[PDB]
Amino acid sequence: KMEAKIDELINNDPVWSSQNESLISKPYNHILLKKNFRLNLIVQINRVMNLPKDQLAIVSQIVELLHNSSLLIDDIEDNAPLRRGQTTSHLIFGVPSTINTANYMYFRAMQLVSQLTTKEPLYHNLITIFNEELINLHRGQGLDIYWRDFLPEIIPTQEMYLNMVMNKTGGLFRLTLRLMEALSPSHGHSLVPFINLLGIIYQIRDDYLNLKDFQFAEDITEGKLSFPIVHALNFTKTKGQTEQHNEILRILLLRTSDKDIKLKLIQILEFDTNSLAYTKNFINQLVNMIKNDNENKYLPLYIIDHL
Amino acid sequence: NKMEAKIDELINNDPVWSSQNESLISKPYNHILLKPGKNFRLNLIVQINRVMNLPKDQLAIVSQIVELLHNSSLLIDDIEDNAPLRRGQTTSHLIFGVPSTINTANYMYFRAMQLVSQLTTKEPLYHNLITIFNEELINLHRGQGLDIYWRDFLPEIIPTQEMYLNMVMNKTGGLFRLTLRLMEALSPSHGHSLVPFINLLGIIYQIRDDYLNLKDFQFAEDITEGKLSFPIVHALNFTKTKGQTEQHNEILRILLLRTSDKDIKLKLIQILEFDTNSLAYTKNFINQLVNMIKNDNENKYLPELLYIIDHLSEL
Numbered sequence: 001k002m003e004a005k006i007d008e009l010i011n012n013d014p015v016w017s018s019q020n021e022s023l024i025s026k027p028y029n030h031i032l033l034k035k036n037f038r039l040n041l042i043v044q045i046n047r048v049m050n051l052p053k054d055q056l057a058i059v060s061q062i063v064e065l066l067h068n069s070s071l072l073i074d075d076i077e078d079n080a081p082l083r084r085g086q087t088t089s090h091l092i093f094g095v096p097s098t099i100n101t102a103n104y105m106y107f108r109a110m111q112l113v114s115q116l117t118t119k120e121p122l123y124h125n126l127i128t129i130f131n132e133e134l135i136n137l138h139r140g141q142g143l144d145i146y147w148r149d150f151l152p153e154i155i156p157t158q159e160m161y162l163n164m165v166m167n168k169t170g171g172l173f174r175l176t177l178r179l180m181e182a183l184s185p186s187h188g189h190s191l192v193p194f195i196n197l198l199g200i201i202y203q204i205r206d207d208y209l210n211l212k213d214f215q216f217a218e219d220i221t222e223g224k225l226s227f228p229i230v231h232a233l234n235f236t237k238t239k240g241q242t243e244q245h246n247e248i249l250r251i252l253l254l255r256t257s258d259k260d261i262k263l264k265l266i267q268i269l270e271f272d273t274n275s276l277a278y279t280k281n282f283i284n285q286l287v288n289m290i291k292n293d294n295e296n297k298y299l300p301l302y303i304i305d306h307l
Numbered sequence: 308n309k310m311e312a313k314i315d316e317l318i319n320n321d322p323v324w325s326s327q328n329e330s331l332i333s334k335p336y337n338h339i340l341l342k343p344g345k346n347f348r349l350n351l352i353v354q355i356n357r358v359m360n361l362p363k364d365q366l367a368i369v370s371q372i373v374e375l376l377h378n379s380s381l382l383i384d385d386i387e388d389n390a391p392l393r394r395g396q397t398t399s400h401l402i403f404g405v406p407s408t409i410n411t412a413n414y415m416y417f418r419a420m421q422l423v424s425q426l427t428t429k430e431p432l433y434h435n436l437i438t439i440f441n442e443e444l445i446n447l448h449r450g451q452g453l454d455i456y457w458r459d460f461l462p463e464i465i466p467t468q469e470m471y472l473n474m475v476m477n478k479t480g481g482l483f484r485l486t487l488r489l490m491e492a493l494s495p496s497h498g499h500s501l502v503p504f505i506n507l508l509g510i511i512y513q514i515r516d517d518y519l520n521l522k523d524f525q526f527a528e529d530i531t532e533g534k535l536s537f538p539i540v541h542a543l544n545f546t547k548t549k550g551q552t553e554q555h556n557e558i559l560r561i562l563l564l565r566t567s568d569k570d571i572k573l574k575l576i577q578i579l580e581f582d583t584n585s586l587a588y589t590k591n592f593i594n595q596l597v598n599m600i601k602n603d604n605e606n607k608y609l610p611e612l613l614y615i616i617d618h619l620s621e622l
């Protein structure tokens with residue numbers, strides 16, 4: 001009867017219950033409490049693409065799974081205690097379950113791609129898009145983490161920083177857009193260059209506000225090669241400002257939560273390298289590239305301000 | 308206008324990525340490759356192929372896919388298990404850090420995925436292969452999710468033998484079925500599906516892995532990890548059934564210590580030895596599974612194969 005139960009088990013598909021499904025979904029469901037704005041960007045873009053609502057909703061579900069899962073992983077990789085003022089998933093469910101659940105969701109997302117179309121040519125394209133951007137997202141993340149964890153072995157320049165962003169942040173943006181463009185039953189030049197720009201603006205502003213809001217500035221504690229930090233390191237290098245250059249490095253290397261020390265790094269950025277003003281300006285120019293796109297080379301606005 | 312011009316160029320092109328960038332993020336992965344077994348996993352594929360007859364070009368690609376998935380799963384697994392060693396060498400996360408190791412492992416899941424396109428140009432087949440890839444990776448993560456949940460939230464859920472076996476069908480069964488199913492789908496030919504057989508192989512493999520981790524010690528790292536192993540699942544249900552309250556609680560207590568103390572680990576092992584007879588039970592359960600194949604004279608499960616089964620511990 002032992003052998004009989006084994007026969008039954010190996011001839012059936014692996015058993016999995018809704019109760020099991022809920023257990024593994026816990027770390028994921030916790031971050032859901034943190035979507036209205038990203039859905040808006042998708043609805044807006046769909047005016048140019050025109051996917052039928054149902055197909056649109058699946059793209060949205062795919063994009064929500066990747067977004068949320070990648071943030072669960074990112075918070076573990078950044079040792080972040082909070083995400084939108086709430087305790088991070090891994091601190092509640094543990095790093096092990098959270099890594100597994102986030103990765104599980106990548107593949108659930110991958111499965112939804114199959115429900116976008118039954119046309120084999122188009123399907124293959126969609127998987128190829130998914131695959132390529134997840135690959136880019138990972139390269140970008142990998143390089144960002146490498147710079148941070150091997151500091152001070154490599155100090156990126158602005159150009160290296162911008163390529164890392166095109167991979168990382170650009171991956172998620174282009175994935176949503178490229179899927180939508182491949183599905184369009186319609187719509188002008190591709191909006192990829194435009195979504196790339198949005199992604200870059202999004203990341204620099206994210207780096208900028210992390211330091212500006214403090215002026216918690218968790219990016220400092222993390223040791224991240226942020227856009228303002230990249231500017232300051234290369235500024236001090238260039239001007240031969242040895243002590244300042246080394247002091248930025250020292251603070252980043254402390255992995256500090258000390259408010260006083262964080263403020264000091266901010267003092268260097270405000271008074272010595274003027275990196276926060278330089279970033280504010282850099283962002284404004286990226287944005288004016290669109291505000292001033294009268295001939296619609298990028299455009300097919302409100303979203304670019306609430307990015 | 309030079310900035311705009313550079314920005315315009317940057318955004319109208321694919322993201323820049325160098326071979327140098329590629330080597331820096333491959334560190335955690337290149338490191339686990341320095342571990343053996345590759346030959347043995349290849350040996351199983353080779354033997355299975357005597358049935359499937361995939362051309363060597365294709366078989367090579369199937370093997371690259373499975374190897375990437377295998378090694379990446381292990382990198383993640385060692386982080387999830389807080390493992391300090393793997394095949395006698397330091398785990399990657401301890402060298403390059405957990406952050407880089409998670410990213411790299413996940414990166415390789417997608418490289419493995421990308422490779423599936425190199426198996427065929429036939430779109431219906433392509434669709435079938437990716438579906439197989441997607442399904443078993445979903446199964447693998449479900450199984451791993453349960454194994455980890457049971458362990459990290461113990462005693463919230465004490466799995467029974469049946470729950471354990473289902474978890475294994477999903478987790479270890481996932482990787483064994485992935486390889487086999489890809490091959491069955493690519494076969495140009497050859498008898499009943501080998502899925503039941505490959506599930507049994509995954510099950511013998513897992514319970515034997517659990518078994519040997521304790522028997523070899525009798526470093527029993529599974530005890531330090533607090534894993535709900537086959538012998539541990541038997542012990543916990545055996546003691547509850549027989550009303551051995553103190554022994555049932557002490558097993559849970561030792562698991563929850565996450566201890567490396569050798570005497571404490573030996574104490575737990577000897578409890579399973581003389582008190583619950585979990586080592587004997589497991590050993591016999593393994594032999595019974597193996598006998599289901601060795602006594603498969605009607606080739607119900609079966610299509611060098613037995614050789615594998617005996618050196619299964621080295622895949």
Ligand SMILES: CCCCC/C=C/CC(C/C=C/CCCCC)(P(=O)(O)O)P(=O)(O)O
Pocket residue numbers: 067070071073074078137138141168169172173206
């Ligand atoms: C392979 C994992 C990729 C994770 C990418 C996420 C990064 C998160 C950040 C912000 C990125 C947000 C991307 C939003 C994309 C919306 C579609 P954070 O500030 O929330 O930590 P950062 O670590 O790059 O700064």
Ligand SMILES: CCCCC/C=C/CC(C/C=C/CCCCC)(P(=O)(O)O)P(=O)(O)O
Pocket residue numbers: 348380381383384388447448451478479482512513516622
């Ligand atoms: C999503 C990650 C799945 C990881 C599955 C791997 C588990 C590893 C083990 C062994 C599993 C091996 C899978 C079969 C390999 C066949 C070549 P270990 O002993 O190396 O830690 P276990 O945690 O199941 O015991």
Ligand SMILES: [Mg+2]
Pocket residue numbers: 516517520
């Ligand atoms: Mg094991």
